RNA sequence: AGCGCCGUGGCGCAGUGGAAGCGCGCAGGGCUCAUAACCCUGAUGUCCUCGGAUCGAAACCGAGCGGCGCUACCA
């Protein structure tokens with residue numbers, strides 16, 4: 001006759017609980033499937049993309065069970081500016097008798113190592129196959145830098161298409177193309193609205209979507225039926241994600257860099273400041289291993305304008321007091337995961353949308369900010385994400401010098417001015433400083449119809465740099 | 471027994487503003503009793519009662535309630551007043567309100583004193599209230615000082631020292647005030663270490679905090695740090711906030727960041 | 738979550754320091770041949786829950802209730 005909390009705590013103890021990561025693992029022997037890595041830190045990053053007013057927080061909640069805030073009391077229902085994050089752990093039963101489509105399950109971040117089987121009729125125990133994180137990209141036309149930032153942090157894609165609306169949705173196509181720009185061909189298609197459709201209409205939508213993707217780069221993207229209200233066939237989503245999406249090559253020989261996209265300070269209001277915490281920036285790992293008690297630097301830094309007007313970018317160097325990976329404060333960071341890096345920086349730096357799309361680096365490494373850069377770019381034929389009512393979907397216009405073009409370097413939102421244009425290369429001056437380390441693939445957006453529209457991809461070749469000031 | 475008028479004499483002066491409680495109404499007017507002074511009766515006439523046309527008197531006067539008025543003529547032989555009510559300017563009523571409120575406080579306090587000591591208010595007023603009103607114009611400022619500075623009881627003769635002791639006890643019991651002085655400083659630091667900066671800042675802030683009034687720097691926003699102080703003396707808290715601002719400026723000037731000001735220390 | 742505010746007699750605001758306040762209401766009555774206008778008299782509650790001071794508190798203070806404006810979703 002124990003209460004619910006006692007039963008769940010007993011299952012938590014019997015399930016192994018949440019192990020603590022040892023301080024100094026033998027790094028050169030660990031893989032993302034290792035027990036020390038798979039228990040507390042994310043390994044595969046996946047994103048949800050779809051049209052507006054379709055529901056990406058609801059499907060993510062059904063998959064995982066972790067809600068997204070969608071804050072500011074006005075963005076709660078229309079669209080979101082910041083990232084909607086959630087944590088999912090994917091489990092499979094260790095018994096062969098269980099149904100393979102249904103043995104897959106997903107649970108919250110606070111779940112134990114081995115939860116009991118929730119299927120009535122089997123005494124097996126679940127096993128965490130692989131750890132994933134889910135990110136909610138904002139699907140609206142006014143917010144385009146956020147989607148490209150998500151593509152930069154995303155390594156897997158989840159497209160959402162509703163049924164009762166128009167089958168060839170342009171925003172879904174634009175998201176798919178922007179993800180293909182990010183060199184990501186591991187995409188999964190999902191049908192958002194299924195219940196209100198008939199027998200024939202679901203197949204009609206399936207054939208329409210099949211016709212939608214025949215000439216694009218995507219080849220083997222599966223189509224999955226799911227409903228965001230009944231909370232069913234989420235095991236199908238986890239199955240498809242585990243089977244189709246592999247782990248990108250990411251190991252210890254690569255240099256540590258991080259790409260910070262969000263910002264959340266830790267400052268409890270009303271509580272005495274004597275019990276506080278430093279400023280925390282939210283960023284993902286694309287290369288390198290991090291540890292508690294290191295020193296980081298935000299190289300774009302404080303951007304000051306002098307009397308002349310030149311950009312003085314002071315790197316913000318700081319000491320990492322805490323490393324957080326999706327459940328608890330841990331020590332060692334595996335490449336390919338989202339982490340809130342907390343340091344002793346002033347809380348003003350981590351409150352608002354300020355550290356949006358920037359890079360940070362550890363000591364012994366000097367990335368370079370740039371002012372004038374050279375980029376090799378190419379376009380497509382038709383505009384994506386626009387609705388031309390049956391008249392010749394607009395074709396991209398050629399770039400013009402001295403035009404404000406939003407050159408999103410992977411995730412960095414920079415407003416570049418063209419100083420020269422040739423057949424396939426361009427030169428741009430940046431007002432907001434942008435760093436370049438190795439490749440940092442780029443997307444380009446322009447403005448004609450009062451908004452920002454993606455036009456094509458871009459890759460940096462050279463540029464004039466400004467060495468950091470001490 | 472509430473008697474022994476607030477001022478130094480029981481009779482009015484020719485131009486003053488006063489406040490009155492109505493007692494009854496007759497056909498030619500109302501002979502009512504003054505409360506700014508002790509009890510002396512006087513006429514307010516209907517022609518100089520209401521501002522607009524006198525359509526009703528019950529709605530306007532509301533016998534048994536408090537109203538503003540002035541005095542035009544005085545009978546200084548046995549006691550009779552001629553008063554006015556329409557000639558009360560928009561500015562007159564406000565100062566009448568404040569004057570009556572301070573008078574009512576100083577009256578109720580000493581009325582409690584008389585009731586607890588069972589001695590007529592006349593002697594108590596002649597022994598205490600009158601010299602204080604002579605010295606500082608009004609006894610309420612003297613009561614505030616006695617709350618702060620206790621030299622106000624030097625050179626004044628009570629009927630007995632028990633009277634002074636009980637009166638000081640009632641001052642401590644009844645006239646409890648501080649003022650919530652609040653300021654808001656804009657933080658603009660993006661320097662290297664910026665949390666130990668605030669820690670040291672408020673370590674210094676609580677270091678100088680006096681025993682009598684507390685100093686706590688509350689956090690509401692990362693840029694907006696709020697400083698709330700309970701000014702018991704209403705003049706040293708501003709100095710406290712300025713000293714805290716000096717300390718935070720000294721903190722920020724050398725880490726590498728800057729800060730701004732939105733709300734200076736203001737009550 | 739931080740503080741500013743509010744807490745009707747039905748709605749809206751004020752007084753806070755001697756215990757029931759107004760305009761709007763609503764009922765009854767009055768003037769009018771008649772109605773509105775105008776003039777009278779009312780019966781509706783814990784001025785949000787619980788305590789300290791005092792002959793006294795709703796007022797001053799204190800140890801929490803629901804909603805409101807900025808700060809902001811503060812791992």
Ligand SMILES: Nc1nc2c(ncn2[C@@H]2O[C@H](COP(=O)(O)OP(=O)(O)CP(=O)(O)O)[C@@H](O)[C@H]2O)c(=O)[nH]1
Nearest residue numbers: 052053054055056057058078079138139192193228
């Ligand atoms: N009937 C039905 N409703 C759905 C389905 N999916 C989402 N919805 C509803 O769409 C509405 C949109 O709300 P919400 O998901 O929070 O907004 P959002 O998806 O975060 C905004 P954006 O798509 O730009 O990120 C929700 O009320 C949700 O219940 C669905 O499959 N079926």
